[PDB]
Write an enzyme that holds these catalytic residues in place. Structure first.
Site, short mmCIF file in Angstrom:
data_model
loop_
_atom_site.label_atom_id
_atom_site.label_comp_id
_atom_site.label_asym_id
_atom_site.label_seq_id
_atom_site.Cartn_x
_atom_site.Cartn_y
_atom_site.Cartn_z
N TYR A 1 0.87 -1.15 0.00
CA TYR A 1 0.00 0.00 0.00
C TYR A 1 0.91 1.20 0.00
CZ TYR A 1 -3.81 3.25 0.99
OH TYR A 1 -4.69 4.32 1.00
N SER B 1 -5.33 0.91 -5.06
CA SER B 1 -5.38 2.33 -4.93
C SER B 1 -3.99 2.87 -4.75
CB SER B 1 -6.28 2.66 -3.85
OG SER B 1 -6.65 4.03 -3.96
N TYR B 2 -3.59 3.33 -3.59
CA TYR B 2 -2.17 3.80 -3.45
C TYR B 2 -1.22 2.64 -3.73
CZ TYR B 2 1.44 7.20 -2.17
OH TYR B 2 2.46 8.13 -2.22
N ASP C 1 -15.74 3.81 -10.65
CA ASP C 1 -14.89 4.31 -9.58
C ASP C 1 -14.95 5.84 -9.54
OD1 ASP C 1 -12.72 4.87 -7.75
OD2 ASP C 1 -11.74 3.01 -8.40
N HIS D 1 -14.76 1.90 -6.43
CA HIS D 1 -13.42 1.70 -5.91
C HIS D 1 -13.24 0.37 -5.16
CE1 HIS D 1 -9.40 3.06 -5.27
NE2 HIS D 1 -9.51 3.04 -3.96
C1 LIG Z 1 -6.35 5.00 -2.92
N1 LIG Z 1 -5.81 4.66 -1.82
C2 LIG Z 1 -6.67 6.45 -3.14
C3 LIG Z 1 -5.58 6.99 -4.04
C4 LIG Z 1 -4.62 7.72 -3.11
C5 LIG Z 1 -5.50 8.18 -1.96
N2 LIG Z 1 -6.52 7.13 -1.83
C6 LIG Z 1 -7.68 7.50 -1.18
O1 LIG Z 1 -8.72 6.87 -1.37
C7 LIG Z 1 -7.64 8.63 -0.14
N3 LIG Z 1 -8.72 8.56 0.84
C8 LIG Z 1 -8.64 7.83 2.12
C9 LIG Z 1 -7.71 8.53 3.12
C10 LIG Z 1 -7.66 7.78 4.47
C11 LIG Z 1 -7.09 6.38 4.19
C12 LIG Z 1 -7.98 5.62 3.20
C13 LIG Z 1 -9.40 5.50 3.77
C14 LIG Z 1 -9.97 6.90 4.04
O2 LIG Z 1 -11.29 6.68 4.55
C15 LIG Z 1 -9.09 7.65 5.05
C16 LIG Z 1 -10.05 7.72 2.74
C17 LIG Z 1 -8.11 6.40 1.88
#
Ligand SMILES: *C(=N)[C@@H]1CCCN1C(=O)CN[C@@]12C[C@@H]3C[C@@H](C[C@@](O)(C3)C1)C2
Ligand SMILES: *[C@@H]1O[C@H](CO)[C@@H](O[C@@H]2O[C@H](CO)[C@@H](O)[C@H](O)[C@H]2NC(C)=O)[C@H](O)[C@H]1NC(C)=O
Ligand SMILES: *[C@@H]1O[C@H](CO)[C@@H](O[C@@H]2O[C@H](CO)[C@@H](O)[C@H](O)[C@H]2NC(C)=O)[C@H](O)[C@H]1NC(C)=O
Ligand SMILES: *[C@@H]1O[C@H](CO)[C@@H](O[C@@H]2O[C@H](CO)[C@@H](O)[C@H](O)[C@H]2NC(C)=O)[C@H](O)[C@H]1NC(C)=O
Ligand SMILES: *[C@@H]1O[C@H](CO)[C@@H](O[C@@H]2O[C@H](CO)[C@@H](O)[C@H](O)[C@H]2NC(C)=O)[C@H](O)[C@H]1NC(C)=O
Ligand SMILES: *[C@@H]1O[C@H](CO)[C@@H](O[C@@H]2O[C@H](CO)[C@@H](O)[C@H](O)[C@H]2NC(C)=O)[C@H](O)[C@H]1NC(C)=O
Ligand SMILES: *[C@@H]1O[C@H](CO)[C@@H](O[C@@H]2O[C@H](CO)[C@@H](O)[C@H](O)[C@H]2NC(C)=O)[C@H](O)[C@H]1NC(C)=O
Ligand SMILES: *[C@@H]1O[C@H](CO[C@H]2O[C@@H](C)[C@@H](O)[C@@H](O)[C@@H]2O)[C@@H](O)[C@H](O)[C@H]1NC(C)=O
Ligand SMILES: *[C@@H]1O[C@H](CO[C@H]2O[C@@H](C)[C@@H](O)[C@@H](O)[C@@H]2O)[C@@H](O)[C@H](O)[C@H]1NC(C)=O
Ligand SMILES: *C(=N)[C@@H]1CCCN1C(=O)CN[C@@]12C[C@@H]3C[C@@H](C[C@@](O)(C3)C1)C2
Ligand SMILES: *[C@@H]1O[C@H](CO)[C@@H](O)[C@H](O)[C@H]1NC(C)=O
Ligand SMILES: *[C@@H]1O[C@H](CO)[C@@H](O)[C@H](O)[C@H]1NC(C)=O
Ligand SMILES: *[C@@H]1O[C@H](CO)[C@@H](O)[C@H](O)[C@H]1NC(C)=O
Ligand SMILES: *[C@@H]1O[C@H](CO)[C@@H](O)[C@H](O)[C@H]1NC(C)=O
Ligand SMILES: *[C@@H]1O[C@H](CO)[C@@H](O)[C@H](O)[C@H]1NC(C)=O
Lengths: 729, 729
Positions: free
Chosen positions: A510, A593-594, A671, A703
């Site tokens: 991640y 995602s990340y 998404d 997503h």
């Molecule tokens: C995938 N991870 C996307 C792309 C980069 C940022 N990310 C997000 O969705 C950002 N939103 C959050 C931030 C924090 C951690 C994760 C859950 C969340 O509810 C709190 C929303 C992702």
């Protein structure tokens, strides 16, 4: 050994179910709990119960009930049905109110259909709800509503609910209203998205729909026009006595009004004192106002003597946002997690009119959250125990003597339980501990008066029994040393793990800012199948940018996403090779995602380390992602700020290096978060330089790719790909 | 055999190029031909040439000339540049005109940028063009243009150009303008799409574009509101700078006006006589009007006694629409291909004044096209020779004695040449024959008076000599019998084909109504590489619904798409699989657009004959496809017409049956023709029943997936898939 393994079907079909114990405190003494679709009420002290609501009472209802909530005074129950998911937290539903005393439904002045949010006041049975983007208040369940706002406008003005970006990135909630402690005032935010550009995408729907619909959502990407926000407070006690009650505005401080800003925290201190935290669009500067009701002007005033500034020289403010204050009863002081002088997050104690606070905790470890506060004690969760940043325990600090700190959970069962969260009764008289690893979840009830264990609520012995018959994988949690710094990792290891043999490795990534993928939590997931059935080692690594270990680590990626966190994953795989049990010809990487972004960046690095990888819903270019999240770490994509780095950290610019690997790219078409656009640009760039790869789209999935069928299909598709990547000729 | 095979790179990089000879007749005696970027004029009788325009005259033009169009009198040349593709035929461009007498570019009254269509008059050098959906006329290239129409409105009113469905399915052209034979009159249609729904889809564009755009196109799906149409004629000899030009409307006949209808043909008969054909939305009834200019009225009168009704009891009218009439010099009579009482397409001779026509040809074979008409002879192409439906020859028939039919191409070179097309000079004094198979293409020039073969224009001599050093596949054309009917097939056979070896087999399918995939044409395509390098036999089969064999075969799928033509493919494969040289464990199927549909229906049929297949841009559900094409074959998707069969003929309904096959599903995201939607719904149905499959989307590719990088990518990906499908345990 001839026990069955944990297979793909076991995961996809939920063969082995984790038992939970989800209770809801209704007082200091009682909680509600669902037993075989009945709702029981439990006495915490003795453990005796009674039926609060028989499972049969709503057969004659006509609708499948999704959820319920009881008014705080016990007199009414709110029944929610016609649930329709929106984004991560938002949804719409219908609502009826059931009178528990007359034992009848209410059929007059009903909450309308397509209601966006509803909440009881914190005391009594007042209701506030949002419908067609405007706020309404019911003093009594059967009586007509008072309208509070007339400005509501679809996709434009949101009163008392967040827009897309505030929901996802700021409040982690849909609701943007806040009742005062005894329900006199209703505070709320109003969001204006007039000039925010729209993300537009097709949604195909059931096969019967002839023309696809275009979904259009106000969504600011990096550097684009953000929503603006205003804050108001109305006196609901004045409603039945006045024609049209005035919503008093509390304006942002001057230091915020000079530029783009956000409302990032609302917290009531007393009946007549509210605190607000504001955050500049450049998220390294935040201001807390503390505002008092002036009884002779009907206005809200925030004395500058009470204003608190929180800033950062090395990164952004807070883990994901400035943290919330916890006020003492009289509202004259408060506790707050802030980054100390050494970069560790600790509890600081403030008087409301003094600028310098006093740290009550300290050390090379972090306070995760403040859980409760009484006149004598503050309870919080930290990763202090045994220097393990991936563990969590509940602690109790004595307010009259800070050297007196008891760990309430550390030694309850140290072999089985290193990861706790807690749930306190209404005035912290009791607490439920929820242990979630490294062994099977364990839920226990405790009394605060003496910190004595009252009873085990749920120990998961049923599951434990079943799991004996299964060749379960094990988990190793450890660290490796880089430049005199500890970096943690975990490994899901196949059963009968043999260090003399060489194993295929999958790096599960991640690695977003303040993330933590190495911890003590017990999980039954895809990795469980891969280690158990396929004999793959599934590893994760917390490198630079990862959380709960101080700012030195967390802020190392400041303004530099797509660098250290990427190269530290590559280095992690190298270090795992050196360990001697890894087949260095069979190393794979994947993430969502990340994690998709990082996977793709790693696969495009040219490192030679990885044979193959899977990116699910990846970010591909920071300019495609939302403003609030992206700008927090990257600042603005302009020549005078950080554009060069925005342009240097795209997946697309590494397209040529994907010639060296096997790549699988997957993305849901609907998404709303990481837009299909992002993968559409990766695929185009790959086609453009003549790289073959694998692709899968999921029609109308968001997503989460979380619908039952899509969930099974994606993990099935990914399993085949991994197995193909790994199997021997 | 030490020779190289025909590889995938050879196909993709066009290593072996067919030589062409594309000429343009400018008179009865002379033609233009582009040679070395120079334009030359050839005398047809002798073969001598002159330079008409040197390849350097525009060396300092400052733009790349996309194309050129010389006025019919040779005085001007229209230079096309800034070409931007729209749909199959539509594009916009910029134009400049060069004066050949003055030897200079015209710089005043220039044709505007973003011109949608331009055309010279048929004689002289008048110009008509369309810009912002309106029609303009220039009497002289340097003079101001007269504005003919004022109603043009993007996506709404189309003057002198077609909307989406008329371009694709009616006229196979963007233009909706028709000059009278000497340029006096300009006829034109007007399209009104006010209530036609829009297809909407995302376009991602270059990486730099932050938010994807939504493309919106007026596109009527089966059963939806269609464009309406009007027809007009304007006299270009009586235009004024002072007054707005007057257009005279010719309204459709009453039998059309009673309901939805189309304009499907416009053909000028004389200087003062125009014919039009109209087609009911239920496409089994069309009518021709023949309209005479009335000098004292200034109006156009279409006498009822000159209406001609064309209908079908077994299907629709015409192959894809009612055929074009070919008028005599006086315009008092005309020749037209129509289905005879046996259901075979033959030439009927009509008097404009008389209801009954006379067939001048007959037999169990069909006339393809009327190519040229003199007072003595009508020239046509048919598939009469040797009773082969997939061969084409040029014939002439003596107008005074129909028993005198001469084949002009049949015996020229029977071994190399069985498939011809023809291009006649202005008064049919000369003709060019283009042989395109079964051997290498051969272009020859002939004179009509005694059918002398004057000279060989291009014999592909060079290519022949290159091909001798390659292991080229051969082609077998043959037939099988089903219920007493001949159905033809072809097989691309690997070099050194051995009837005792077992070869895997790929069924290349299209199989749309009136299609022909079994023919004598020479082709260098994907199939060539598959046969030559991979030793795969590539077969195609023309079953029920296929064209050029009479209506009994062609109309078999009337109202019943996705039935007999799918069944017949399975049956052909079944018969191929029992041949000695076919490996029945390795039979695959693939197709594009209608072929993708059939491929999908076959894979979902449960037949067990096919191991794997590939669908590219398939139709999946007839209600997603366009009205004009779909309804031609299916009628309307209403309960009182043909809705039950619309719903019984979806790919989606057969998802379960894919469980036992390997499927690759591919589609361009910017396909305006067969919408991405169609594949989105296939994938979603496959996910819903738990079927794993392979997918690939092409970001921003349309229906052709034809950009040079995407084209290489798709064929590379499909090659991997077929190779893996055919790899032996
Ligand atoms: C995938 N991870 C996307 C792309 C980069 C940022 N990310 C997000 O969705 C950002 N939103 C959050 C931030 C924090 C951690 C994760 C859950 C969340 O509810 C709190 C929303 C992702
Ligand atoms: C309650 O008061 C608000 C605030 O004045 C009213 O909303 C205003 O209405 C006028 C005219 O309709 C608009 O021009 C203003 O822009 C509105 N102001 C705001 C802040 O929304 C509202 O109409 C009143 N409601 C009733 C029932 O009288
Ligand atoms: C909840 O708190 C509010 C705000 O302090 C109380 O309202 C005030 O009550 C005092 C009575 O002691 C009055 O003097 C003020 O006029 C009230 N102010 C306002 C703004 O209403 C309220 O009484 C409390 N409610 C309950 C149920 O205890
Ligand atoms: C908040 O972040 C920005 C960006 O890191 C800081 O702005 C920079 O400040 C330094 C010192 O004045 C300048 O040299 C740079 O030119 C600034 N960069 C910009 C404006 O993009 C700002 O100082 C930070 N605030 C704090 C308290 O550290
Ligand atoms: C194109 O067609 C539309 C209808 O599809 C025409 O609009 C109608 O025009 C009449 C007379 O002006 C009105 O009474 C109707 O209300 C209109 N209908 C709709 C749906 O708008 C329009 O005039 C046509 N345009 C041209 C140039 O012919
Ligand atoms: C093209 O054909 C038109 C139509 O027949 C010719 O125009 C007519 O010519 C006659 C004979 O000179 C005139 O008396 C008519 O008044 C004309 N009719 C119209 C409608 O204009 C025209 O001469 C021909 N053009 C050329 C270049 O030969
Ligand atoms: C054109 O096609 C339609 C549809 O097949 C024909 O209409 C059918 O005609 C028969 C006999 O008149 C009726 O019993 C059916 O109910 C009709 N079907 C529908 C869907 O309306 C029509 O007759 C055809 N025209 C010709 C000349 O054959
Ligand atoms: C639970 O029991 C309460 C009864 O009080 C007695 O419980 C006995 C078991 C014993 O421990 C005594 O010391 C207690 O005084 C009763 O008042 C509650 O109403 C009951 N609650 C529920 C939810 O059933
Ligand atoms: C093409 O030829 C013409 C020249 O006259 C020819 O006459 C023939 C009878 C024969 O003897 C040939 O050898 C002569 O060359 C001339 O009028 C055309 O203009 C020429 N050029 C063209 C059309 O480009
Ligand atoms: C794919 N073949 C799609 C889906 C079914 C029909 N088809 C079309 O594109 C229809 N348009 C035409 C009709 C005929 C044959 C093909 C070429 C064309 O120019 C004439 C246009 C397809
Ligand atoms: C209702 O409650 C009883 C236990 O008191 C239980 O047997 C039954 O299964 C419950 N019914 C449902 C539908 O949950
Ligand atoms: C909500 O919807 C249904 C109609 O679908 C209606 O019968 C019902 O009364 C509505 N409820 C309210 C509170 O309006
Ligand atoms: C929202 O902001 C726009 C300007 O962006 C303004 O015109 C409009 O009045 C605002 N609406 C509110 C605050 O209700
Ligand atoms: C076409 O575009 C060019 C470049 O912008 C412009 O200078 C020229 O005038 C245009 N041509 C016409 C005829 O308007
Ligand atoms: C011609 O018609 C258009 C649109 O109806 C009008 O705007 C224009 O002024 C007219 N011109 C003349 C010269 O009549």
């Amino acid at each position: 050994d001839s026990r069955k393994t944990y297979t793909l079907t076991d995961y996809l079909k939920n063969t082995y179910r984790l038992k939970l114990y989800s209770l809801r405190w209704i007082s200091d003494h009682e909680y509600l709990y669902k037993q075989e679709n009945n709702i029981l009420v439990f006495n915490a002290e003795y453990g005796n119960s009674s039926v609060f609501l028989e499972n049969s009472t709503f057969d004659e209802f006509g609708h499948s009930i999704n959820d319920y909530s009881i008014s705080p005074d016990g007199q009414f129950i709110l029944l929610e049905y016609n649930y329709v998911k929106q984004w991560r937290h938002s949804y719409t539903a219908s609502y009826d109110i059931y009178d528990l005393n007359k034992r009848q439904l209410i059929t007059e002045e009903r909450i309308p259909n397509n209601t966006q949010w509803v909440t009881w006041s914190p005391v009594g049975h007042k209701l506030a709800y949002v419908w067609n983007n405007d706020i309404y208040v019911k003093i009594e369940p059967n009586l007509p509503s008072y309208r509070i706002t007339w400005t509501g406008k679809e996709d434009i003005i949101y009163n008392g609910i967040t827009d897309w970006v505030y929901e996802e990135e700021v409040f982690s909630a849909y609701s943007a209203l806040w009742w005062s402690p005894n329900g006199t005032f209703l505070a709320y935010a109003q969001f204006n998205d007039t000039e925010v550009p729209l993300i537009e995408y097709s949604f195909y729907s059931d096969e019967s729909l002839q023309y696809p619909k275009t979904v259009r959502v106000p969504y600011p990407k990096a550097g684009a026009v953000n929503p603006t926000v205003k804050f108001f407070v109305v006196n609901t006690d004045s409603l039945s006595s006045v024609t049209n009650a005035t919503s008093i505005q509390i304006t942002a401080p001057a230091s915020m009004l000079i530029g783009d800003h956000y409302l990032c925290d609302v917290t009531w201190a007393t009946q007549e004192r509210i605190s607000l935290q504001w955050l500049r669009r450049i998220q390294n500067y935040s201001v807390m106002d503390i505002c008092d009701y002036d009884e002779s002007s009907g206005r809200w005033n925030c004395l500058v003597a009470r204003q608190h500034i929180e800033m950062s020289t090395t990164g952004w403010v807070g883990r994901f946002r400035p943290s919330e204050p916890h006020f003492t009863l009289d509202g004259n002081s408060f506790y707050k997690i802030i980054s100390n002088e050494e970069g560790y997050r600790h509890i600081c104690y403030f008087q409301i009119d003094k600028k310098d606070c006093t740290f009550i905790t300290k050390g090379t470890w972090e306070v995760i959250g403040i859980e409760a506060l009484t006149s004598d004690y503050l309870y919080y969760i930290s990763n202090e125990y045994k220097g393990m940043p991936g563990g969590r325990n509940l602690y109790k600090i004595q307010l009259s003597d800070y050297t007196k700190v008891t760990c309430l959970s550390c030694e309850l069962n140290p072999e089985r339980c290193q990861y706790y969260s807690v749930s306190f009764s209404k005035e912290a008289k009791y607490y439920q501990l929820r242990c979630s690893g490294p062994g099977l979840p364990l839920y226990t009830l405790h009394s605060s008066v003496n910190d004595k264990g009252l009873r085990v609520l749920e120990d998961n012995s049923a599951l434990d029994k079943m799991l004996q018959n299964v060749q379960m994988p094990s988990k190793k949690l450890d660290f490796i040393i880089l430049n005199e710094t500890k970096f943690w990792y975990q490994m899901i290891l196949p059963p009968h793990f043999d260090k003399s043999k060489k194993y295929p490795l999958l790096l599960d990534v991640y690695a977003g800012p303040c993330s933590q993928k190495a911890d003590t939590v017990f999980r039954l997931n895809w990795a469980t199948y891969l280690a158990s059935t396929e004999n793959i080692i599934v590893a994760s690594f917390d490198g630079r940018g990862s959380g709960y270990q101080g700012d030195k680590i967390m802020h190392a990626i400041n303004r530099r996403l797509g660098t250290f966190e990427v190269e530290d994953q590559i280095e992690a795989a190298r270090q795992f090779s050196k360990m001697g049990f890894v087949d260095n010809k069979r190393i794979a990487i994947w993430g969502w995602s990340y994690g998709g972004y990082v996977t793709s960046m790693v696969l495009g690095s040219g490192s030679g380390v990885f044979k193959c990888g899977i990116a699910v819903a990846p970010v591909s270019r920071w300019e495609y992602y939302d403003s609030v999240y992206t700008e927090r770490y990257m600042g603005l994509p302009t020549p005078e700020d950080n554009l060069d780095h925005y342009r240097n950290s795209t997946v697309m610019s590494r397209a040529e290096n994907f010639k060296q690997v096997e790549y699988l790219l997957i993305h849901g078409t609907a998404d709303d978060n990481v837009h299909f656009q992002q993968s559409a640009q990766i695929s185009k760039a790959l086609v453009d330089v003549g790289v073959d790869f694998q692709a899968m789209w999921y029609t109308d999935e968001d997503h989460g790719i979380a619908s039952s069928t899509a969930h099974q299909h994606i993990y099935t598709h990914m399993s085949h790909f991994i197995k193909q990547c790994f199997s021997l000729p």
